Structure formats: structure tokens, C-alpha cells
Amino acid sequence: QVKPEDEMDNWGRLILDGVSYSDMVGARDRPKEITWFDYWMSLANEYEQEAERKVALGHDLSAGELLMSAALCAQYAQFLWFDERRQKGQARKVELYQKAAPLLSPPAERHELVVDGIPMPVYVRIPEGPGPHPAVIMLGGLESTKEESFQMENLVLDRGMATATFDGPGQGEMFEYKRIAGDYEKYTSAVVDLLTKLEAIRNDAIGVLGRSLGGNYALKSAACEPRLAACISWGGFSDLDYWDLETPLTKESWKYVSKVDTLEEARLHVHAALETRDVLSQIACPTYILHGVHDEVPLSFVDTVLELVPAEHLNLVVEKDGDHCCHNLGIRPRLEMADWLYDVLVAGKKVAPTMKGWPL
Amino acid sequence: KPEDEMDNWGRLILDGVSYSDMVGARDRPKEITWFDYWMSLANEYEQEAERKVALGHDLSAGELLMSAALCAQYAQFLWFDERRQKGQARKVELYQKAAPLLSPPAERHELVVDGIPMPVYVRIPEGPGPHPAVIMLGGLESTKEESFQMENLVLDRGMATATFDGPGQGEMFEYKRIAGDYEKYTSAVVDLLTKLEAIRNDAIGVLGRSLGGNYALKSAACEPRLAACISWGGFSDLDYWDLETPLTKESWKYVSKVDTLEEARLHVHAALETRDVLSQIACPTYILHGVHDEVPLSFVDTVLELVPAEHLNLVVEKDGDHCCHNLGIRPRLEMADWLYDVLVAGKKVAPTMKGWPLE
Numbered sequence: 001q002v003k004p005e006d007e008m009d010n011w012g013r014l015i016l017d018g019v020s021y022s023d024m025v026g027a028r029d030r031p032k033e034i035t036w037f038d039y040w041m042s043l044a045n046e047y048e049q050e051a052e053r054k055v056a057l058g059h060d061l062s063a064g065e066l067l068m069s070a071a072l073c074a075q076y077a078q079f080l081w082f083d084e085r086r087q088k089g090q091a092r093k094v095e096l097y098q099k100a101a102p103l104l105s106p107p108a109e110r111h112e113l114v115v116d117g118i119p120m121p122v123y124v125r126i127p128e129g130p131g132p133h134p135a136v137i138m139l140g141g142l143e144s145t146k147e148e149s150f151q152m153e154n155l156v157l158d159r160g161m162a163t164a165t166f167d168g169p170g171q172g173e174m175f176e177y178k179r180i181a182g183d184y185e186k187y188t189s190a191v192v193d194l195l196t197k198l199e200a201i202r203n204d205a206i207g208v209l210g211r212s213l214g215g216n217y218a219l220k221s222a223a224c225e226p227r228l229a230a231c232i233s234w235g236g237f238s239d240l241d242y243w244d245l246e247t248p249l250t251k252e253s254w255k256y257v258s259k260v261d262t263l264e265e266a267r268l269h270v271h272a273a274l275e276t277r278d279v280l281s282q283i284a285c286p287t288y289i290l291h292g293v294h295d296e297v298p299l300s301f302v303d304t305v306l307e308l309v310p311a312e313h314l315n316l317v318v319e320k321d322g323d324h325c326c327h328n329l330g331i332r333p334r335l336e337m338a339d340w341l342y343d344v345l346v347a348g349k350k351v352a353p354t355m356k357g358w359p360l
Numbered sequence: 361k362p363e364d365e366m367d368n369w370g371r372l373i374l375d376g377v378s379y380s381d382m383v384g385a386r387d388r389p390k391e392i393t394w395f396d397y398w399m400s401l402a403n404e405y406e407q408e409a410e411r412k413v414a415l416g417h418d419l420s421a422g423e424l425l426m427s428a429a430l431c432a433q434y435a436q437f438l439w440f441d442e443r444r445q446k447g448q449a450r451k452v453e454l455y456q457k458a459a460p461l462l463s464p465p466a467e468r469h470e471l472v473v474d475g476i477p478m479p480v481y482v483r484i485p486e487g488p489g490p491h492p493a494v495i496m497l498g499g500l501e502s503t504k505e506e507s508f509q510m511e512n513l514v515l516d517r518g519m520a521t522a523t524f525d526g527p528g529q530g531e532m533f534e535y536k537r538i539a540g541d542y543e544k545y546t547s548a549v550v551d552l553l554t555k556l557e558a559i560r561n562d563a564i565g566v567l568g569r570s571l572g573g574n575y576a577l578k579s580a581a582c583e584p585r586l587a588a589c590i591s592w593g594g595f596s597d598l599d600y601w602d603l604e605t606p607l608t609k610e611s612w613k614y615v616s617k618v619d620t621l622e623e624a625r626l627h628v629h630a631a632l633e634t635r636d637v638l639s640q641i642a643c644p645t646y647i648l649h650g651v652h653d654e655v656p657l658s659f660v661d662t663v664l665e666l667v668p669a670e671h672l673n674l675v676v677e678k679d680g681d682h683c684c685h686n687l688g689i690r691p692r693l694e695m696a697d698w699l700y701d702v703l704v705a706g707k708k709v710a711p712t713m714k715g716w717p718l719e
């Protein structure tokens with residue numbers, strides 16, 4: 001019952017992610033013959049000529065910021081687009097971030113991993129001062145990919161934690177290689193192997209932060225990976241019982257990432273692939289769950305995680321006014337996330353299992 | 361409308377006011393007033409920041425206190441009844457707490473100019489120095505607490521920042537209505553910077569925002585020490601008075617401590633004239649003017665005539681409103697980088713002109 005234009009113009013999400021308010025208003029007030037896709041793609045071009053000029057003049061900092069802006073314009077042109085152009089927007093986002101990454105401070109380093117014989121670029125960022133550092137692996141979702149987590153990265157890098165980002169099955173760069181799968185944990189696991197190998201990172205101090213579907217992937221990664229010292233499900237879920245409650249374009253995304261023909265074929269595939277209730281009892285790390293009450297993800301997920309995640313590990317935050325990922329609530333919840341990832345990973349504070357805003 | 365002037369989406373968002381906060385302001389229950397809405401938020405922000413300090417989350421504590429200050433600032437910035445002073449005080453005390461928590465910290469230097477306290481806040485870039493510095497000037501309602509976002513851009517680019525409230529502004533308003541000798545207070549701020557060893561004495565520019573731009577032009581013309589100058593939504597005189605929004609005229613009235621509009625006009629037009637003095641400027645000057653500013657393009661005629669050619673970098677933005685706030689961050693990045701060229705880089709930038717002549 002929600003409209004396509006309105007699923008795309010998620011003011012909260014796009015503004016917190018770093019999309020310019022003024023571009024937003026221009027998207028909203030754009031002429032009716034200009035599509036959402038074209039509008040945002042033209043801006044991506046604009047921002048890219050800007051950054052070229054900056055580099056030419058020796059303005060590297062500005063050029064990194066303008067390239068981030070261009071990549072975010074590409075991300076958001078295509079994120080809920082399903083025709084022949086989607087492919088080009090995805091590819092344009094990737095091109096733009098590749099240029100942005102070495103101009104970002106601190107820089108995003110490329111590590112070209114290969115999982116199950118499939119190339120998987122890993123982007124790593126490292127905070128100020130001599131080595132080593134805790135890391136937060138950040139997990140994308142249904143449309144959220146490595147190129148989009150910039151501002152959340154910046155929060156944890158400010159708090160002396162490195163970041164690592166990648167696109168696995170059904171996501172971003174790997175979508176062409178693999179449809180969405182039931183063993184995402186092996187992707188997160190491969191990455192931990194990179195970080196355990198890279199001498200700039202503390203091996204006992206790796207955690208995982210998953211956003212939306214990434215939320216689900218984080219819980220799965222933690223349930224299957226003893227070496228991870230932190231799990232955050234940020235607007236995630238335990239299983240797909242709740243399918244009928246999904247928005248129309250979310251149902252479209254599920255079908256798109258599954259590469260099936262019908263919604264019921266998608267539901268079937270995703271429900272089995274993304275189940276976690278058989279293994280939630282294995283998560284053995286401090287586990288922070290941020291849940292918006294107004295999410296399409298219903299409160300039975302909160303029931304499930306209380307029922308199944310070991311009581312000693314669960315840090316449960318339910319925001320009564322929160323939408324999906326609590327984007328509508330501003331930066332507060334993100335800060336809280338980053339500070340708690342600090343307490344676990346950099347602080348060494350053995351945090352007490354706790355509840356906020358539950359029960360209602 | 362008074363509501364639309366207050367809801368300046370571009371201005372507030374770029375300055376760091378939360379979009380979520382702005383939505384609840386636009387959609388507030390009608391019985392809850394703009395003032396009270398924002399003041400209630402600053403309290404909430406302050407409480408969360410105390411919890412954060414208690415938990416060792418110093419970096420979030422600063423950001424939340426910075427949020428508190430701005431909610432206080434924007435509650436009171438166009439308010440004129442008895443609560444106005446309480447709003448101003450709340451902002452002042454909130455920022456005082458925020459300042460040591462900032463990254464990098466804003467350090468308090470306590471000046472007195474002729475019996476009159478003038479708090480100056482100084483922020484230093486990372487690692488060793490000495491460091492170039494940018495003095496930043498507030499406007500009609502912009503005060504030292506407001507410029508956090510512009511600060512961070514220039515501090516990212518290796519330049520110290522210094523902020524203060526001059527005649528008719530902020531903390532000084534109590535002691536001194538708007539005045540004809542703002543150059544005096546700027547030069548005092550320079551004095552301190554010249555004395556502090558962590559700052560480059562031949563590397564101090566001035567960045568004036570809105571009315572602050574008029575002050576920046578006045579100072580550069582009266583201060584041979586100044587190595588750089590930006591007029592950001594500034595002006596050279598007040599011939600254009602009638603063109604000011606209703607709330608701007610009310611602010612003029614207010615900062616002039618008079619009861620009538622014509623009293624306000626007479627006083628400010630005299631006090632704020634620069635045209636007799638603009639040709640005396642011997643430093644790099646950047647003027648950013650938005651075509652749809654209530655400030656007319658006559659200003660551009662004045663400056664091209666009177667600011668000497670070898671120093672003028674003119675930027676006219678044809679879609680820009682007042683201070684080009686409706687154009688997002690790009691003009692602000694352009695200012696921070698230009699200051700970087702003049703003050704950090706061993707760089708002589710040549711007299712260039714962008715967006716002018718008009719189409």
C-alpha cells in the first residue's frame with residue numbers, strides 16, 4: 001500500500017547516509033518527464049566533473065567528498081530500480097567509489113579476495129595513529145552495499161576502530177556472480193581471515209555490524225563464527241515468517257536478488273536461505289539488536305531473539321518511534337551503535353546484558 | 361511568512377540541525393511554539409550528553425552538546441519577546457560545555473575590550489605548528505556558537521579558527537548595540553592571535569557570514585595584518601533596506617536597540633558603510649553572492665568598482681539565495697579550499713571572476 005516514489009524518497013535514510021538535502025528537494029520537485037534514475041545519475045555526473053576539477057587544483061579532501069556524493073547519487077538512482085538500466089547504475093556506483101576510496105580520509109584500501117572461486121573486493125579503512133586496530137566488518141543488505149556505509153564508517157573510525165566492507169551473494173558486485181544464498185557466514189568468515197592475517201588489526205577484537213538484511217547476516221555470521229567479538233543487528237530479522245508484511249518494492253528486491261520469476265518463488269527461496277532460529281543459540285559474542293517498532297519487521301522478531309539469543313549476550317534496544325533501521329530518528333541510534341561497538345571492541349568493558357524500551 | 365523564515369531548511373541542515381528535528385518542528389502541534397519546541401530539544405540533547413560523559417563517550421558528548429547549542433540558537437535566532445534573552449543564554453552555556461569536548465577542542469581566551477568581556481574561542485588543527493588561522497564573524501543572528509560546520513572544514517584543511525561576539529551580537533548585545541567600528545573588535549581578535557605562538561602571524565584571514573561579510577570587508581580595509589578575506593552573503597552598505605524580509609527589519613530594530621524601523625535604518629546605514637574604505641584593502645578577497653539574495657546585485661557593482669582588481673575573487677551563484685544555503689555544501693567547500701590556497705599553500709591566486717557578468 002506504499003507508493004514507489006515514496007519508498008525511494010526515504011528522507012531519513014538518504015540524509016543520514018550523506019545525500020545532500022538540496023539534491024533531495026530537487027529530486028522531489030523534478031519535472032514529471034524526468035525519471036528518478038536519470039535525475040540522480042546526472043547529479044552523479046555533475047559531482048564527478050567537480051571532483052576532477054578539485055584534484056586538478058590539489059583539493060584532495062574535497063575531491064574525496066564529491067566522489068562520495070557522486071557514488072551516493074548512483075547508489076540511490078538504482079537501488080530500487082529493476083529494468084535493464086539497474087545494471088548500469090550498479091556499475092556506475094562501483095566505478096565512482098573506486099575513485100573516491102583513495103581520496104577519502106582515512107583512505108579505503110582495496111584487498112582483492114576470492115571466495116569459493118569468486119572475486120570479492122574488500123575495502124578497508126584504518127584510524128589515526130600507529131598499529132594495530134579493532135575492526136568492524138560492515139554488512140550491506142538488500143540494496144545497501146559497501147559504497148553506501150561511508151558515514152557509519154566515519155563514526156566508528158572516529159572512535160579508533162577500523163572498518164571492512166564487501167558485497168556477497170545477491171549483493172552489489174557479486175550479484176552477477178551469485179544469487180542470494182544460505183551460507184553468507186562463509187563470506188564474513190573469509191574476511192575475518194583477511195583481518196586476522198593483516199597485521200594492522202587486533203585479532204581478538206573483530207566485530208560485525210549488519211544493516212537491514214545485513215542485520216540478519218550479522219546474526220548468522222556470529223552464530224557460525226566463534227572468533228567474532230561483536231554482533232549488531234541494525235534493523236535485521238531472524239527469519240522470513242513476516243514476508244506478507246514486506247513493502248511492494250521490498251518484495252520486488254527479494255525476487256530480484258533471488259533471480260526467480262514470481263514472488264512466491266522468492267519467498268520460498270529466501271525463507272529457507274535466511275533462517276537463523278536453528279543457530280541463534282550458538283552466537284557467543286555481545287550482541288546488540290536495534291529494532292524500530294514501526295518496521296515492517298514485526299515484534300515477534302524481538303520475541304524470537306529474547307527466546308533464542310543467549311541471555312548473557314543480548315543488548316536489546318527497541319525504539320518505540322523507530323521505522324525500519326530507525327532512520328526516521330536521526331543520528332542518535334547510530335551514535336549509540338558506534339559507542340557500544342567502542343565499549344565492546346576498544347573500551348574492554350564487559351557490558352551487562354540489558355534491555356532498553358522493552359517491554360512496551 | 362515568519363514560519364518560513366525560521367524554517368530555512370538549507371541554512372539549518374548545512375549548519376548541522378538534524379533533519380528529523382526539523383520535521384517535528386514543521387509538524388509540531390500548533391499549541392507548542394517554535395521557541396519551546398527547540399528549547400525542549402536542547403534540554404534533551406544536554407541530558408543525553410551528560411550520560412555520554414558519564415560513560416566515557418566524550419566524542420558523542422561533544423556532538424550532542426553541539427546539537428543542544430544549535431537547538432537553542434535556532435529557538436531564539438528570530439524571536440523578539442522576553443524569552444529571547446533566555447534563549448541566547450541557553451545557547452551560550454550549552455556551547456561552553458561543548459567546547460572542551462570538540463575534536464579538536466575550542467579553547468577559551470577571555471578578552472576584555474574597554475571594560476567589556478569578549479570571550480574568544482580558538483580551535484587548533486592536529487599535530488605540531490604553528491598554524492594559519494581563520495577568524496570567523498557572525499551576522500545579525502549568527503553567533504560564535506553557530507559556525508561549527510564551517511570550522512570543521514577549515515580545521516580539516518590545516519587552519520586554526522577563532523570566533524567571538526562583537527557589538528550587537530550574542531553575548532556582547534547586553535553591553536553594546538550594533539556599532540560603526542567593528543574593525544576594532546576584529547583587530548583585537550587578531551591581537552591575541554599575533555600574541556599566541558601556535559598561530560602564523562602572517563597567515564591570518566577573516567571569513568564573514570551574512571552581516572559578518574560586511575564586517576569582514578570593513579576589517580580587511582582597516583587591518584593591514586590580515587592575509588585573506590571572505591564576504592559570504594555580505595554587503596557594502598544598506599541602500600537596499602526596503603528589500604529586507606519582515607523578520608530581518610525586526611532584527612535590525614533589535615540589534616540597534618530602537619523602537620522604530622526608521623530609527624533602525626538611519627543608525628545601521630551609517631554604522632555599516634564600507635564604500636569610503638574598500639579601496640584600502642591590500643589582501644586576497646573572496647566574495648560569494650547569491651543572485652536571489654535580498655541583497656541586490658548593486659553590491660557586485662560596488663565591489664567590482666571599489667575592491668582593487670588584483671585582490672578580487674568574485675563568485676556569483678545564479679541559483680543561490682542568501683549565503684547560497686540552498687545550494688548545499690559545494691560553495692562552502694569552495695571557500696575552505698580557497699582559504700587553504702591563500703593561507704596554507706605558498707600560492708598566489710590570480711584575480712578571477714566566476715558567474716559574472718550575468719546571462
Ligand code: NA
Pocket residue numbers: 195196197198199200201202203
Ligand atoms: Na591481524
Ligand code: NA
Pocket residue numbers: 553554555556557558559560561
Ligand atoms: Na602567533
